């Protein structure tokens, strides 16, 4: 029996694509977020994340659905919230339904276009008093370090670039000395290379060989605790959890810690005609955030810079070396930007049955959450890197508030061989967000406790805003079986929000879903090895409303001009009249911000579905097979006002359409063998294919969504880039005339193929080179049970992925970024030379002669992989030794996450998931236990 | 079981101050003028007087005319406004509470929801509270492992009465109208006094609402590894946060102006306290001996933060617009944190022999972050003894005395309730970003350049406080003795209490000597103070043989308080006593020194025969020549005020007859001095800083030749005699007896309600603070609130109790 919306149906009576998740593995993955702890157990649901200690996750359901925001809608004990789950207690979990469909998720709202994830929490069982106590102590180790070139290879690369120019390499701005000459074969050979002693003339900074990715990185411990007490009688139940989870990241001076609590209960009074219950949660998270671009800064700075000066201050690029801040200083100054986040839930449902089989309900949600921060800035001095002696402190504060109310009323009848369930009810909502801030300047002492905004001297500012939302709706549902053969369900939800235009308030969303069994038909009784086979099909129509709050309002704004605008644009409304030329007493006025239409509308999607169930071989080989085809029809794109409309012409209109189709196929084989062993192998294989149907205007031309301003996106998939084709190097001398009219043609300088074959090195040779929607995404869970032992493994992967690497631009070209003399990655030290003609890496030039920074097939890798997510070995302590200590179950398990990975030949990198500069994925090793009374 | 309790009340202003009206104002003024012998037609207000002389030659008033407007340009009409009726209203109270409970062999569980809402009798002031509480506990293993939790969650919100509206309402004359001709708020113009429109103040302050969320609770574990041995650990959490926007609207009530200032301040505060302890206790019962031991440890920590953003100048003047992002003027930012922690080690030992001799022992060692390590901890022992007299066999020849128990105790308690920064020398940057009054911001910014500003000025630091390396714990030491009793088989019961209670090494924020200058104050252990007194409880309860149960239980007590020693600069300070003219050492906390008023000079004769008294004439206050030097000067003051009652008392009458129930609670305080500052406004025309304010209605009885039988000084226009000086004229007898509450109830007979499935249904009806007995010599309204605090209303209430 599972929960789908507000009701509970049977397990074998579903009609939509309700994918129920086994929650026996969520505590075995060992993470903060449960959604990150899925990461492949379900099909058609791409979850991508980092090794951020908060464990936040980017979730897509059934592939990409809409151009703008498409986060799914979580539901935690009736009350919904679209934001969180890395701060919620991820261990009071009873079942996680995932409603991937639209004809089964149409009941829950208009805002269920991206699919809803129904979560429920634990409860008290009848006649049990059990109490558990979990723990874990882990360790995080770094594995995916990109290799960079140190001082000798840096000097060799600089010498190679200057002799490929032909300029004397000894006339460089850096402190290098080169002893070199000419070989008899014409190629220059570097004989001797010698550094200086200091970095400048004034002898402030010595030279060294600093390992930056070994300087900002530590091993980080990870702790965890838990406790859970239950209860339960024939008239009441209770539950009461606790928690703690402390994570210290692999990058230095970032962390996360979460405290938690939970109280659940219910009380049934008069023969089950009156039932009051509640659900409550209370968290506190406290995360120090990593700064922006700290991996890229750790790649950029040359290794000759020391981490300290002659005195205790930080070292820096004192002259000639490019302007990159010391990353150890960036992590040492972003140490006490700690925020603090409280959060509460609520529920109070009241049940009432007047005669029999006919219930009523009236809940009341609540969702409060505030967030206090205090962000410091400091004065620094590293050679030429100086913030000019500036001190400030910003003291933010944000607030959120939601509350719902709904009153369903269900009916239940069983006569003959027919059962049915009709329910009706309304719903309410209200969101009241806020924030404000402060600012001060020019402090005297520099510590995180002196720098409160009263101990300052300088100028001050203040900020703040406020938002809102409302909703009111009515719904309905039906069920039918008529023989325990032919299932049928119809829903309908009329709903009207507070962001829809003035022309139409209420929106209607119908749904039809039907399914019928096979093995209960009497003409199939000759097939005895089969056990159950269920057909299903459905057709729904949902559509979200995550449009901006000011889409229908024609905003006017004061804009006196106190805020800063560089260039003198400064769209102000002051205008000193009387010719005073002085004094801050100027009059004010209103400029127009944007212009709204009154005919705004939700983003409706019409999604069909066809599914097939099976079960064989005395309840084994279970699994499903589904097919789906969705089509959103009204996507919002804000368009700039043409010409004579002047300022404030950005009108939000809704036109655009996408369509998605694919397959899902899960399977599971559980069977005990004669060896004295029991195995279980669940697994799933998905398939995904996207298309943009039509895009309205020149927004399709400039390429906000797809091709980079040179090709239309309509017809192809979403996010597909369009660029050149690079097929090799100018290896021979006769490539300058074997090729056709190349602009930059040298002994390096990768060739671009002709498409028009007319000497075309114009911008008319680009084609679609990169589409990020892979086929053949799959996963596999493997479970073993020997005597007194248990082993759990996992595998997850995807085949046929294209990625756009930007560490390849940093590691294959000497001059591709803007600033010069940056550190690189040590793949380019084996570049093309007259001595070594056996490498595909181009030559090392000092200037971008041939335009090599264009988008091209040289920057497309094979992103297919297969990596083990976790493996966990346990050891259950046997019966009489545990029962001598008056306890039920004991366990001493061990596990490790992300232990290995295998990739293709076609990838010169370090991590096939995130090739770019994000937070890395570290290896965990866990040594925990599980005391169960 | 389950309990639904609901109530509704009307709240009515009662003791309202009698204040001149427009006609009365003009009569008093004519008297004030002619008394001083000036032309009463020279009041630059709108009054003109037809007056003359009687046969004996004293002035007499015949008729009186008032102009129609208070200004020449006729923007402010003349009123007879009753300003207190104009700022008060009938308050409304609501109260609802539900609670539900469940008890099983293996645990218990409680859940309540509550709401309060109270619209005070001062307009535009209100309060409300939402409350939930959940408690539960679980017995596992052999009831030997126990877990429990108590937790309450509360959201309150309030708009508070502005500072000084009662004084403003007392001060603003009737002639000033609520509304000006144009429909703006009314205000003084012309010659009319410097007083703001009190209705407008309250309205301008109606949106200064704070919202306050407090979470309070704990969780605990308890282990009993064998019989009599218990271990327990409790983690407490106490966390509140308070938000508010305070709005500054522009005002303009006649000449009462604000220029055109508009501003908003968004303020936030957080108080986060938590507590942690572990407890170890042993019990044992040996035939006749009984005994508890308990040792344990406790940690406390509070961390506070507060900050706020301030913005000036708004185009639309509503709380919808007035957010900081939308101001076009100057901004300010405020805030800071603080905190402290406490460590605590303690043990307690109980012993009982034969259930007739009892001994008890307490010993703590207590440290605080607020002291240096050289003084962190202090050690506090305690000792008490018991003597259950009646169980001794020779007392059992007394059938009429059920139990009688004599007890005595000695013990000490630390006190460290001081500023978190008390130890330190404090320099603050204090650029000067903050509202002052009349200047004296004491900021460190200065235009050292002479540019006249426009940009950030150089600034610095100013000393707030001098440190003290050796602050220690203050110690309060109590000796106590008392006796409990029970006569006539449990119908006559009660207890006495006598105690001596002394605080030594008292922690005193001690001012600096004058020449020390800016921020010369320091916290010192310097000072001592006693409190000794008697406390008595006595209750009688019995049924009667016609249906009436009656249960009286009353109480009474008295104390004396004496400051024993005091730093020299606090004695001269007056901070705790004699007005900075005499040192309060040896007198009650808050005692006050003053001139002795000795009636009124009633005859030129009596001035010339009195000591020399600057400003003394016929009709003025005769001040006593205490030193007998023939001069009335600053030396002639003595101890004239003590805030300590001779005794206070309380009494609860309870009746039950024929399903009805009646309760009265009376409370009295007897023998108290109050100092009245309304009397300054009621008995004089010029005992105030500013001329032409509204006056109390009593001075219509002021002494004159006309009216020679009076205590009220003759009306004058100048305080020549300085009758504003602190004197016995302002001390009155603030003794009172008040019906704090009376409640009447019917509870429907069981057989009737039990069939609607109700163990208890009851309706009731009550009134709080319905009646006040006071002294004839008290001249104001509420002896318990004789001046300007929020008035104490009479509530009248209806309500009900339902339980399943």
Q: Coil, strand, or helix at residue A468?
A: coil
First to last CA, chain A: 27
Q: What is the distance in angstroms between the Cα of A127 and the nearest Cα belonging to chain B?
A: 10
**Tokens 């209770």, residue located:** A238
Report the alpha-carbon distance of residue A564 to residue A441 in Å, rounded: 17
> With helix as H, strand as E and coil as C, how does A294-363 read?
CHHHHHHCCCCCCCCCCCCCCCCCCCCCCCCCCHHHHHHHCCCCECEEEEECCCCCEEECCCCCEEECCE
Q: Give the dihedral sign, CA B624/B625/B630/B635.
A: negative
Please answer yes or no on whether B337 and A452 come within 8 Å at the CB atom.
Answer: yes
Measure CA A147 to chain center: 26
User: Phi and psi (nearest 5°) for B86?
Assistant: -75, -25
B contact test, residue of A446, A452, A887, A931 with most B CBs within 10 A: A452
In angstroms, the Cα distances linking B350 to B91, B278, B287, B294 are: 52, 19, 16, 9
Please answer yes or no on whether B336 and A454 come within 8 Å at the CB atom.
Answer: yes
Residue A590 corresponds to which tokens in the numbers above? 């209103």
Size of interface A-B (CB pairs under 8 A): 151
Q: What is the distance in angstroms between the Cα of A464 and the nearest Cα belonging to chain B?
A: 5
- How are strands ordered across the β-sheet holding A440-441? A375-377, A392-394, A440-441
CA angle B106, B112, B118 (to 5 degrees): 165
**Tokens 């940057």, residue located:** B429
Contact residues for B542 (Cβ-Cβ < 8 A; gap 6+) = B491, B549, B550
Report the alpha-carbon distance of residue B61 to residue B54 in Å, rounded: 10
Q: What is the distance in angstroms between the Cα of A262 and the nearest Cα belonging to chain B?
A: 11
Q: What is the distance in angstroms between the Cα of A463 and the nearest Cα belonging to chain B?
A: 5
Resolution limit in angstroms?
4.7
Residue A556 corresponds to which tokens in the numbers above? 């006017």
Residue A549 corresponds to which tokens in the numbers above? 């709050």
Residue of A nearest to B153 (CA): A344
- Do residues A554 and A600 lie in contact, with contact meaning Cβ atoms separated by under 8 Å? no
DSSP bridge partners of A872:
A792, A895
- Do residues B496 and B528 lie in contact, with contact meaning Cβ atoms separated by under 8 Å? no
Q: Coil, strand, or helix at residue A830?
A: helix
Please answer yes or no on whether B134 and A238 come within 8 Å at the CB atom.
Answer: no
Please answer yes or no on whether B309 and A457 come within 8 Å at the CB atom.
Answer: no
- Do residues A909 and A885 lie in contact, with contact meaning Cβ atoms separated by under 8 Å? no
Of B130, B5, B323, B272, nearest in space to A403 by CA:
B130
- Do residues A424 and A490 lie in contact, with contact meaning Cβ atoms separated by under 8 Å? no
Helix (H) or strand (E) holding B433: none
User: Phi and psi (nearest 5°) for A591?
Assistant: -100, 160
Report the alpha-carbon distance of residue A691 to residue A777 in Å, rounded: 18
Please answer yes or no on whether B456 and A452 come within 8 Å at the CB atom.
Answer: no
Please answer yes or no on whether A236 and B100 come within 8 Å at the CB atom.
Answer: no
User: Is B629 marked as binding a ligand?
Assistant: yes
Report the alpha-carbon distance of residue A356 to residue A413 in Å, rounded: 10
DSSP bridge partners of B3:
B99, B803
Please answer yes or no on whether A453 and B109 come within 8 Å at the CB atom.
Answer: no
B contact test, residue of A265, A277, A347, A464 with most B CBs within 10 A: A464
Please answer yes or no on whether B428 and A455 come within 8 Å at the CB atom.
Answer: yes
Query: Any idea of the CA torsion for A348, A353, A358, A360, to the nearest 10 degrees?
Result: -30
User: Hey, which bits of B227-262 come out as E strands?
Assistant: 229-248, 252-253, 256-257
Please answer yes or no on whether A129 and B109 come within 8 Å at the CB atom.
Answer: no
- Do residues A425 and A474 lie in contact, with contact meaning Cβ atoms separated by under 8 Å? yes
Q: What is the DSSP letter of A398?
A: E
Q: What count of residues does chain B have?
A: 804
Residue A252 corresponds to which tokens in the numbers above? 């230095």
- Do residues B161 and B120 lie in contact, with contact meaning Cβ atoms separated by under 8 Å? yes
Alpha carbons within 13 A on the beta-carbon side of B199: 20
DSSP bridge partners of B15:
none
CB < 8 Å to A463, chain B:
309, 324-325
Q: What is the distance in angstroms between the Cα of A551 and the nearest Cα belonging to chain B?
A: 20
User: Is B313 marked as binding a ligand?
Assistant: no
Report the alpha-carbon distance of residue B699 to residue B516 in Å, rounded: 46
CB < 8 Å to B327, chain A:
462
Report the alpha-carbon distance of residue B120 to residue B159 in Å, rounded: 10
- Do residues B384 and B357 lie in contact, with contact meaning Cβ atoms separated by under 8 Å? no
Q: Coil, strand, or helix at residue A676?
A: coil
Report the alpha-carbon distance of residue B347 to residue B342 in Å, rounded: 17
Report the alpha-carbon distance of residue A277 to residue B732 in Å, rounded: 58
Contact residues for B579 (Cβ-Cβ < 8 A; gap 6+) = B592, B593, B594, B637, B726
For A453, the closest of B111, B145, B334 (CB atoms) is B334
Please answer yes or no on whether A231 and B141 come within 8 Å at the CB atom.
Answer: no
Residue B260 corresponds to which tokens in the numbers above? 């055109």
Residue of A nearest to B215 (CA): A282
Alpha carbons within 13 A on the beta-carbon side of A101: 29
The torsion region of residue B452 among left (phi > 0), alpha (psi -120 to 50) and beta comes to left
- The neighbour count for residue B404, using CB atoms within 10 Å, is 18
In angstroms, the Cα distances linking A583 to A577, A586, B454, B557, B659 are: 12, 8, 10, 68, 79
Helix (H) or strand (E) holding B104: strand B90-104
For A129, the closest of B113, B140, B309 (CB atoms) is B140
For A462, the closest of B149, B324, B429 (CB atoms) is B324
Structure-solving method? cryo-EM
- The neighbour count for residue A672, using CB atoms within 10 Å, is 11
A contact test, residue of B1, B2, B259, B309 with most A CBs within 10 A: B309
Contact residues for B160 (Cβ-Cβ < 8 A; gap 6+) = B125, B208
Measure CA B37 to chain center: 45
- Do residues B313 and B251 lie in contact, with contact meaning Cβ atoms separated by under 8 Å? no
DSSP string, A225-244: E--EEE---SSEEEEEE--E
Of A636, A770, A637, A769, nearest in space to A702 by CA:
A637
Report the alpha-carbon distance of residue A537 to residue B771 in Å, rounded: 78
Residue A927 corresponds to which tokens in the numbers above? 């040594």
Report the alpha-carbon distance of residue A721 to residue B563 in Å, rounded: 86
Contact residues for A649 (Cβ-Cβ < 8 A; gap 6+) = A594, A595, A640, A641, A642
Residue B53 corresponds to which tokens in the numbers above? 């002389």
Please answer yes or no on whether A461 and B331 come within 8 Å at the CB atom.
Answer: yes
- The neighbour count for residue B116, using CB atoms within 10 Å, is 16
DSSP bridge partners of A239:
A230, A264
Residue of A nearest to B144 (CA): A886
Q: What count of residues does chain A have?
A: 933
Residue A83 corresponds to which tokens in the numbers above? 């934001």
Report the alpha-carbon distance of residue A378 to residue A326 in Å, rounded: 14
Please answer yes or no on whether A129 and B151 come within 8 Å at the CB atom.
Answer: no
Residue of B nearest to A278 (CA): B111
- Do residues B777 and B706 lie in contact, with contact meaning Cβ atoms separated by under 8 Å? no
Residue A357 corresponds to which tokens in the numbers above? 């089989």
- The neighbour count for residue B657, using CB atoms within 10 Å, is 13
Please answer yes or no on whether A588 and B219 come within 8 Å at the CB atom.
Answer: no
For B328, the closest of A242, A440, A560 (CB atoms) is A560
Measure CA B518 to chain center: 31
Please answer yes or no on whether A229 and B336 come within 8 Å at the CB atom.
Answer: no
Report the alpha-carbon distance of residue A687 to residue A665 in Å, rounded: 9
Of A397, A385, A126, A384, nearest in space to B307 by CA:
A397
Q: Is A14 exposed, middle or buried (0-12, 13-18, 19+ CB in 10 A)?
A: buried
Q: Is B48 exposed, middle or buried (0-12, 13-18, 19+ CB in 10 A)?
A: middle
- Do residues B174 and B25 lie in contact, with contact meaning Cβ atoms separated by under 8 Å? yes
Q: What is the distance in angstroms between the Cα of B361 and the nearest Cα belonging to chain A?
A: 37
Report the alpha-carbon distance of residue A110 to residue A472 in Å, rounded: 11
Helix (H) or strand (E) holding B252: strand B252-253
- Do residues A906 and A796 lie in contact, with contact meaning Cβ atoms separated by under 8 Å? no
- Do residues B15 and B792 lie in contact, with contact meaning Cβ atoms separated by under 8 Å? yes
Residue A209 corresponds to which tokens in the numbers above? 């060989």
Residue of A nearest to B433 (CA): A454
The torsion region of residue B454 among left (phi > 0), alpha (psi -120 to 50) and beta comes to left
Report the alpha-carbon distance of residue A584 to residue B453 in Å, rounded: 13
CB < 8 Å to B305, chain A:
372
Q: What is the distance in angstroms between the Cα of B458 and the nearest Cα belonging to chain A?
A: 8
Q: b/e per residue, B349-384, with b = 16+ CB within 10 A?
A: ebebeeebebebebbbebbbbbbeeebbbbebebeb
Q: What is the distance in angstroms between the Cα of B181 and the nearest Cα belonging to chain A?
A: 30
Helix (H) or strand (E) holding A8: strand A7-9
Alpha carbons within 13 A on the beta-carbon side of B449: 9
Contact residues for B150 (Cβ-Cβ < 8 A; gap 6+) = B133, B135, B217, B218
- The neighbour count for residue B662, using CB atoms within 10 Å, is 15
- Do residues B353 and A492 lie in contact, with contact meaning Cβ atoms separated by under 8 Å? no
- The neighbour count for residue B620, using CB atoms within 10 Å, is 21
**Tokens 């309760």, residue located:** B663
Contact residues for A674 (Cβ-Cβ < 8 A; gap 6+) = none
A contact test, residue of B328, B427, B445, B452 with most A CBs within 10 A: B328
CB < 8 Å to B1, chain A:
none
- Do residues B407 and B385 lie in contact, with contact meaning Cβ atoms separated by under 8 Å? yes
Of A890, A800, A879, A829, nearest in space to A133 by CA:
A890
For B335, the closest of A344, A395, A461 (CB atoms) is A395
Q: What is the DSSP letter of A726?
A: B
Please answer yes or no on whether A436 and B149 come within 8 Å at the CB atom.
Answer: no
What are the helix and strand counts (H, E) for chain A?
8, 60
Helix (H) or strand (E) holding A165: helix A151-165
Please answer yes or no on whether B325 and A464 come within 8 Å at the CB atom.
Answer: yes
- Do residues B727 and B640 lie in contact, with contact meaning Cβ atoms separated by under 8 Å? yes
**Helix residue spans in B88-164 (DSSP H):** none
- Do residues B510 and B521 lie in contact, with contact meaning Cβ atoms separated by under 8 Å? yes
Of A602, A584, A660, nearest in space to A627 by CA:
A660
Residue B311 corresponds to which tokens in the numbers above? 């913005």
B contact test, residue of A283, A345, A453 with most B CBs within 10 A: A453
DSSP bridge partners of B308:
B267, B334
For B324, the closest of A236, A436, A588 (CB atoms) is A436
Report the alpha-carbon distance of residue B715 to residue B700 in Å, rounded: 9
Helix (H) or strand (E) holding B200: helix B198-204
Report the alpha-carbon distance of residue A744 to residue A850 in Å, rounded: 4
- Do residues B220 and B233 lie in contact, with contact meaning Cβ atoms separated by under 8 Å? yes
Q: What is the DSSP letter of A829?
A: G
Of A755, A749, A787, nearest in space to A768 by CA:
A755
């Amino acid at each position: 029996v599972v929960v789908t919306g507000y009701t509970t149906q049977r397990k074998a009576d579903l009609t939509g694509a309700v994918s129920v998740v086994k929650v026996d593995e969520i505590q075995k993955q060992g993470e903060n977020n449960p959604v990150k702890a899925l990461q492949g157990r379900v099909p058609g649901m791409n979850i991508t994340a980092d090794g951020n200690p908060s464990g936040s996750a980017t979730v897509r359901i059934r592939g990409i659905g809409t151009l703008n925001n498409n986060d799914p809608l979580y539901i935690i004990d009736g009350v919904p919230t679209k934001a969180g789950m890395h701060e919620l207690n991820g261990n009071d979990i009873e079942s996680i339904q995932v409603l991937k469909d639209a004809a089964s998720a149409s009941i829950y709202g208009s805002r269920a276009a991206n699919g809803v994830i129904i979560i429920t929490t634990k409860q008290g069982k009848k006649g049990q008093i059990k109490i558990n106590f979990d723990a874990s102590v882990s360790a995080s180790m770094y594995q995916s370090k990109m290799n960079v070139l140190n001082t000798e290879q840096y000097g060799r690369a600089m010498w190679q670039a200057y002799v490929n120019d032909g300029e004397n390499p000894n006339g460089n701005a850096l402190g290098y000395a080169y002893n070199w000459g000419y070989n008899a074969d014409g190629n220059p050979v570097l004989y001797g290379m010698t550094l200086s002693k200091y970095l400048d003339s004034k002898n402030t900074m010595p030279v060294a060989d600093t390992d930056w990715f070994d300087e900002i990185t530590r091993t980080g411990v990870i702790q965890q605790y838990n406790l859970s007490v239950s209860n339960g009688s024939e008239k009441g139940s209770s539950f009461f959890s606790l928690g703690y989870y402390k994570n210290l990241g692999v990058i230095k001076d970032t962390d996360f810690d979460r405290f938690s609590a939970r109280m659940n209960s219910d009380y049934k009074l008069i023969d089950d005609i009156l039932t009051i219950g509640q659900h409550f949660t209370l968290n506190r998270t406290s995360e120090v955030q990593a700064p922006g671009g700290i991996i890229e800064t750790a790649l950029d700075i040359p290794s000759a810079i020391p981490v300290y000066a002659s005195d205790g201050s930080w070292g820096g690029p004192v002259g000639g070396w490019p302007d990159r801040r010391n990353p150890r200083a960036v992590l040492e100054y972003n140490k006490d930007n700690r925020y603090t986040y409280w959060r509460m839930f609520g529920d109070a449902y009241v049940n009432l049955t007047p005669f029999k089989g006919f219930n009523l309900r009236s809940t009341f949600g609540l969702d409060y959450a505030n967030k206090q921060a205090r962000y410091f800035t400091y004065p620094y001095q590293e050679g030429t890197q100086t913030n000019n002696g500036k001190s400030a402190v910003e003291a933010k504060q944000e607030h959120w508030t939601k509350w719902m109310w709904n009153a369903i009323a269900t009916y239940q009848l069983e006569v003959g061989k027919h059962r049915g369930d009709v329910m009706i009810g309304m719903e309410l909502n209200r969101e009241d967000d806020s924030h404000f801030s402060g600012y001060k300047e020019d402090f005297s002492i520099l510590t995180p406790d002196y720098m409160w905004p009263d101990a300052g001297s300088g100028t001050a500012q203040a900020y703040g805003a406020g938002e809102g939302y409302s909703l009111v709706s009515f719904f309905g549902k039906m069920n039918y079986s008529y023989a325990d053969r032919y299932l049928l369900s119809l829903t309908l939800r009329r709903d009207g929000s507070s962001r829809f235009g003035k022309n139409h308030r209420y929106a209607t969303f119908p749904s039809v879903s039907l399914g019928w069994r096979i093995t209960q038909e009497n003409f199939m009784k000759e097939l005895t090895w089969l056990d159950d086979l269920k057909l299903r099909a459905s057709w729904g129509q949902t559509g979200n409303q995550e449009i901006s709050n000011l889409a229908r309002y024609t905003i006017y704004a004061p804009n006196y001009g106190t805020t800063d605008s560089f260039g003198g644009q400064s769209y102000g409304t002051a205008y000193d009249i009387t010719g005073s030329n002085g004094g801050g007493v100027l009059p004010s006025g209103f400029k127009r911000n944007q212009i709204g239409n009154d005919n705004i509308k939700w983003e409706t999607t019409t999604q069909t579905n066809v599914g097939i169930d099976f079960s064989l071989f005395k309840q084994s080989l279970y699994g499903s097979l589904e097919y789906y085809y969705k089509k959103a029809t009204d996507i919002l794109t804000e368009m700039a006002g043409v010409g004579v409309l002047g300022e404030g012409g950005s009108r939000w209109i809704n036109s655009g359409a996408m369509k998605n189709q694919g397959f899902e196929f899960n399977l599971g084989y559980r069977n005990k063998t004669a060896f004295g062993l029991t195995y279980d192998l669940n697994g799933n294989i998905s398939t995904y294919r996207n298309e943009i149907l039509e895009l309205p205007e020149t927004v399709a031309a400039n390429g906000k969504f797809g091709g980079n301003g040179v090709k239309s996106v309509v017809g192809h998939t979403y996010g597909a880039q369009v660029g050149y084709i690079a097929d090799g190097i100018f290896k021979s001398q006769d490539e300058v005339d074997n090729h056709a009219t190349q602009e930059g043609a040298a002994v390096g300088r990768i060739r671009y193929r002709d498409i028009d074959h007319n000497g075309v090195i114009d911008e008319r040779d680009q084609n679609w080179i990169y589409d990020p929607t892979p086929s053949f995404s799959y996963g596999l869970n493997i479970y073993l049970e020997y005597k007194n032992f248990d082993l759990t493994m996992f595998w997850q992967g995807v085949q046929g992925v294209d990625i756009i690497s930007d560490v390849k631009k940093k590691s294959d070209f000497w001059s591709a970024s803007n600033v010069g003399f940056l550190n690189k990655g040590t793949r380019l030290l084996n570049a093309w030379s007259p001595t070594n003609p056996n490498s595909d890496i181009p030559a090392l030039t000092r200037s971008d002669t041939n335009n090599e920074q264009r988008v091209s097939t040289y920057f497309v890798e094979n992103g297919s992989f297969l990596k083990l997510r976790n493996i966990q070995l346990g050891y259950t302590v046997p019966a009489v030794i545990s029962k001598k200590m008056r306890m039920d179950r004991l366990r001493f398990y061990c596990s490790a996450q992300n232990l290995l990975t295998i990739k293709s030949k076609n990838f010169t990198g370090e991590d096939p998931e995130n090739p770019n500069f994000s937070y890395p994925i570290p290896v965990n090793i866990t040594f925990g236990l599980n005391i169960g009374f």
